[PDB]
Design a protein around this ligand. Structure first.
Ligand SMILES: Nc1ccccc1C(=O)O
Ligand SMILES: Nc1ccccc1C(=O)O
Ligand SMILES: Nc1ccccc1C(=O)O
Lengths: 345, 340
């Protein structure tokens, strides 16, 4: 395993083998590779176009080096992120409804800019994002929800932080977050930012060992279920990968005006979310529901997408209540309430 | 000039504008860009494939930041790993008989095959201060410009190139950044692909005439064994030209006779060639000098240049002694001569 050899291989645009990639990612994540080569490799990897074997090798490296808690039965809802519009953090609200019907081990992080990351939104609601493993398991048993902070459960990732920071461009690490759940959740609704990554990440998930994971791409260009048009889906399980297309109306709704679904900070997201829980915002609430509908289908509790949206309707009703208990047990209820107020409670 | 914008642009595999690439190069060569980004940038450039404008941009940048001296009237024979003897250095010597030569070059990484290694083995003092450089060109019509010193800014990208260990855009710029700003030049390239690219870049670097060549089986000089693909670049345009060593009238030289494995051995073969004691090497020296003579427009064709070179090689040893006597140690040259 020589870095220089791996780099020439990449310069020649030839894909890496699984364990070749896994040893490369380990060396990188452990801080054994000079910053200059980590840089060259990440750029070469992206310009070559990372492959299935690459993604799988890196994902397995990160899982090996990660801090783990056990909750396979749990479900996660994390997208890749991607550069785009900047819609409201549905994966975080959709995760609140889901705790009402199944343990949720949400994997997330802080966003680099306007605080569009789930860790920022949750912090805005008053949640204590730093949950040690012993207590995390405790919180999932009492509230059926726990937030797993990437920077906390992947301490070795601090070894690639400066390079990623300095480069300032997306790399292979920006699509690995959702495939590296510290609780090893076997169910997941992974949002992807492009129809290509849809196929790439699905073939990779197939070899990552999930019971059922659904990857989705939102028609506008969103890493979530599309509010306006079709939603391209991939449902991977131990028995294959199903392709599924879906318009917003198949849920029994009329196109949700994007204008109302856009946010420009962690607080506006927190506020809008709550406002939807308070029934004071149809659109944002309808957006949350369609996303929750799919997550429910992945749990195979609901056998249809229209049905899932319906059950999500019931769920959102106990949502603020659920949110209150979640925060009061691990966080500051004060903020939550000053937000309920800023969102008219 | 925002490096992240440039980076993203390269990541999307799109070429840069000339001055966009020039500002990027100036910032890099000035050491104003974190190593992490210089690294990402060089790698993106290589993987995207450097275009004409990026080459021009970088060359113009190194030219401005380089330690300069002025001898536009001079010619240079700098090119861009078979171990063949360095004929551009010997060839530079013949040319100094009829025109000022400002030879730009570095040492070879490996077994001293670089112009600087050969010259030093001949007894020449390859480290020539810029103020002394122009005096030596007036007095002897020849001077060697050690790139490593005439391009001090390059230290800002040394650690990065060292760590990457792969070729970058920098491995092909040297010949386009002559410190004396020589307008006449013969520059070898190591692949046909670099012929088209470098010729188009060179086209825009303000030469009076530059001849680019690629010789089989893969040499940055005129092929002594077969074809030589050549690009004649000038204000009037780019001439595509193919050639065969047999058009010089000679028979293809056996490659084994041109290869050396030592700086001193290369010095010895050049002198034996100068003494009439090695036809093959001297034939390889003359076919290279012939194209350069054509670059200076001293001859009307390659055949005339070859015969002209015949006359120049007969005088090159004494010329060599004159050059070294003014800058270097003639005792080292008398030693190389002792047994050649
Ligand atoms: N997209 C993610 C999902 C989960 C954890 C981290 C990330 C991240 O981008 O760092
Ligand atoms: N960006 C990430 C992706 C996956 C795991 C951890 C991180 C992190 O920043 O700590
Ligand atoms: N590698 C180079 C290319 C051009 C000019 C100088 C150098 C140098 O190393 O000094």
């Amino acid at each position: 395993m020589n870095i220089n050899e791996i780099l020439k291989k990449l310069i020649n645009k030839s894909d890496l083998e699984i364990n070749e990639a896994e040893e490369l990612a380990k060396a990188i994540i452990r801080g054994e590779v000079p910053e200059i080569l980590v840089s060259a490799i990440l750029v070469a990897l992206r310009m070559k176009g990372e492959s299935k074997n690459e993604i799988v090798g890196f994902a397995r490296a990160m899982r090996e080096l990660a801090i783990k808690i056990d909750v396979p039965n749990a479900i996660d809802t994390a997208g890749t992120g991607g550069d785009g519009l900047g819609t409201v953090n549905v994966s975080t609200a959709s995760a609140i409804l889901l705790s009402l019907v199944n343990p949720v081990a949400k994997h997330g992080n802080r966003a680099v800019s306007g605080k569009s990351g789930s860790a920022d939104v949750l912090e805005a609601l008053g949640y204590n994002i730093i949950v040690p493993p012993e207590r995390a398991k405790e919180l999932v048993n009492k509230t059926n929800f726990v937030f797993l902070f990437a920077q906390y459960y992947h301490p070795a990732m601090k070894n690639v932080a400066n390079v990623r920071k300095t480069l300032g461009i997306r790399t292979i690490f920006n699509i690995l977050g959702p495939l590296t759940n510290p609780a090893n959740a076997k169910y997941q609704l992974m949002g992807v930012f492009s129809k290509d990554h849809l196929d790439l990440l699905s073939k990779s998930a197939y070899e990552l060992d999930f019971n059922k994971i659904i990857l989705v791409y939102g028609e506008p260009g969103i890493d979530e279920v599309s509010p306006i048009g079709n939603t391209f889906m991939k449902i991977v399980s131990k028995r294959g990968i199903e392709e599924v297309k879906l318009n917003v109306t198949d849920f029994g709704i009329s196109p949700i005006p994007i204008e109302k679904l856009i946010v420009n900070s962690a607080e506006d997201s927190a506020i809008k979310i709550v406002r939807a829980f308070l029934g004071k915002d149809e659109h944002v609430a309808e957006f949350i529901k369609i996303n929750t509908a799919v997550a429910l289908f992945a749990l195979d509790r609901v056998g249809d997408f229209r049905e899932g949206y319906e059950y999500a309707d019931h769920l959102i009703e106990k949502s603020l209540d659920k949110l209150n208990e979640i925060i009061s047990m691990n966080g500051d209820v004060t903020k939550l309430k000053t937000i309920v107020v800023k969102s008219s409670g």
